[PDB]
């Protein structure tokens with residue numbers, strides 16, 4: 136488990152931490168999820184997201 | 191965009207169009223509710239620019255458009271058009287009144303320098319704009335998009351007589367037929383990361399759009415991330 140391998144399984148950003156662990160993080164307007172890897176919206180219209188139905 | 195497809199409404203909600211004496215002369219991307227990032231060569235004269243966010247079909251009224259006036263132009267401090275119109279080709283536009291963010295008007299994400307460069311290295315980005323749909327042909331009515339692969343630097347240098355510095359990258363196809371074109375300059379080159387798009391390039395320039403052996407030239411956003419974040423902080 137390192138940031139060099141599959142981005143530490145982080146959805147967006149990865150940082151190497153103590154005891155061979157990683158700390159994931161997200162861009163502005165997102166929150167790090169309970170699973171410690173995923174990035175969830177923390178504002179109504181977060182950057183870089185397509186929200187209009189593409190169907 | 192030559193060889194692209196019609197975007198659906200709200201598919202590229204960070205896209206803006208710049209309008210002047212001619213419409214859709216350049217593109218731009220939403221940084222936040224008060225700031226647009228574009229190419230410096232699009233806005234090098236002190237002419238009045240109209241920014242339109244939420245745009246889809248430039249010759250039809252569709253409800254989602256938000257028009258704003260540009261009150262300040264910030265070309266990059268290293269930009270010098272007298273020396274080279276296409277080096278450090280990046281500028282920030284401050285809007286008169288904030289945009290109202292919604293599903294059609296959404297900023298593009300901007301990672302730190304390291305991650306913006308990793309995202310570019312994924313090797314595949316999306317470009318979009320209302321630029322010409324054929325080399326020397328008409329502009330698009332409906333927003334066009336195209337996935338472009340990264341082209342290695344040596345192939346890229348061998349394709350043109352003009353200089354390509356390390357703050358630029360090439361993207362396109364060896365067989366031609368698919369590329370950005372005049373009118374797309376200043377628009378976004380974005381990389382999708384698990385469903386979130388990040389700004390990886392600014393559409394800059396080229397020669398014969400989509401001609402076999404030529405590629406589109408783009409500004410590497412990673413080099414300017416710190417300056418964008420500093421200048422656009424609200």
Ligand SMILES: Cc1cc2nc([C@@H](CNC(=O)c3c(Cl)cc(-n4cnnc4)cc3Cl)c3ccccc3)[nH]c2cc1C
Pocket residue numbers: 276322325326352353369370371372373374375393394395396397398399405406407
């Ligand atoms: C992919 C793409 C291709 C484009 N092609 C055009 C122009 C033709 N290109 C030029 O006049 C040109 C030349 Cl010859 C030299 C430099 N140059 C010098 N030193 N560094 C750079 C820069 C330019 Cl833009 C055009 C004009 C009219 C119709 C069609 C195309 N605009 C484009 C923008 C994009 C995004």
Ligand code: NA
Pocket residue numbers: 245246247248249250251252255
């Ligand atoms: Na419209």
